């Protein structure tokens, strides 16, 4: 460990255009491994990683049937929320849920998640104790009451501490993946002349995974140079990520600036500078 199994669920109503769009996406350690989408040619659970192709037909059938049951349940929820918020039958609305477990290297649950959003805003969430709920507003208070009455927190706790953990263990064994996957970034600095004897130094990090990364520019050493341009981390399209940070510096001073790249794949932080020619 540590490892995690998480499901991201989406239900989107589209009145006038048919039944809601319903999707479930599963992630082992932040890598998608299964997907259900009601809008697919054939609505069924699909392997999204090669190692999942190992699972037999009964698994696919059972999970597909659960998805279909879940789908029906969210159709009902979408209507319920319309009532709670006194909204019209004509609008399009969205329920999202994140559900799952993060387990520590000792194989014990670190945290369980059961979090709901409505129209992109927190609606209700299971607290870290896995016993109580945090409702975001008065509508969620209705749900909170229902679930308190039904012992929902206890049902979820059994799922999160038991079932979720156990499946994660099986999925990891399927993938032969108990060491987290990592690709170290490869970095370089590009040089772009600007008018009036100025120079853009752009420090690139390419081909890294997972996405989490930090880039900094330093003057000499220990400089937390503030006014960098920076782009949000972005997918390259081949499974890896890209990022850059730049500074503008005086022509002839490039050699005093240092770029630093911090990533879990690296034996230690990278340091680099512009390489003239």
């Amino acid at each position: 460990g540590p490892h995690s199994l998480r499901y991201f669920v989406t239900a989107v109503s589209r009145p006038g255009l048919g039944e809601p769009r319903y999707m479930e996406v599963g992630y082992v350690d932040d890598t998608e491994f299964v997907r259900f989408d009601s809008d697919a040619e054939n609505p069924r659970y699909e392997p999204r990683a090669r190692w999942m192709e190992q699972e037999g037909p009964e698994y696919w059938e059972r999970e597909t049937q659960k998805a279909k049951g879940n789908e029906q349940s969210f159709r009902v929820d979408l209507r319920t929320l319309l009532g709670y918020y006194n909204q019209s039958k004509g609008g399009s609305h969205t329920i999202q849920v994140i559900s799952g477990c993060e387990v520590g290297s000792d194989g014990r649950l670190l945290r369980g998640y059961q979090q709901y959003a409505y129209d992109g805003r927190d609606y209700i969430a299971l607290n870290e104790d896995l016993k109580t709920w945090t409702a975001a507003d008065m509508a969620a208070l209705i749900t909170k009451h229902k679930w308190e009455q039904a012992g929902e927190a206890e049902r979820l706790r059994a799922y999160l501490e038991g079932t979720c953990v156990e499946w994660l263990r099986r999925y990891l064994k399927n993938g032969n993946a108990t060491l987290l996957r990592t690709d170290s970034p490869k970095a370089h600095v590009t040089h772009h002349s600007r008018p009036e004897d100025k120079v853009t130094l752009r420090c690139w990090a390419l081909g890294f995974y997972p996405a989490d990364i930090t880039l900094t520019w330093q003057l000499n050493g220990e400089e937390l140079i503030q006014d960098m341009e920076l782009v949000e981390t972005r997918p390259a399209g081949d499974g890896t990520f890209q990022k850059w940070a730049s500074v503008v510096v005086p022509l002839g001073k490039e050699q005093y600036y240092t770029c630093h790249v911090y990533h879990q794949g690296l034996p230690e932080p990278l340091t680099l500078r512009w390489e003239p020619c």
Binding site: G26, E63, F74, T80, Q114, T143, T163, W167
Partner: peptide, 8 residues
């Protein structure tokens, strides 16, 4: 395997 959701 995903959890079975209860109604809101």
């Amino acid at each position: 395997a995903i959890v079975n959701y209860a109604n809101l």
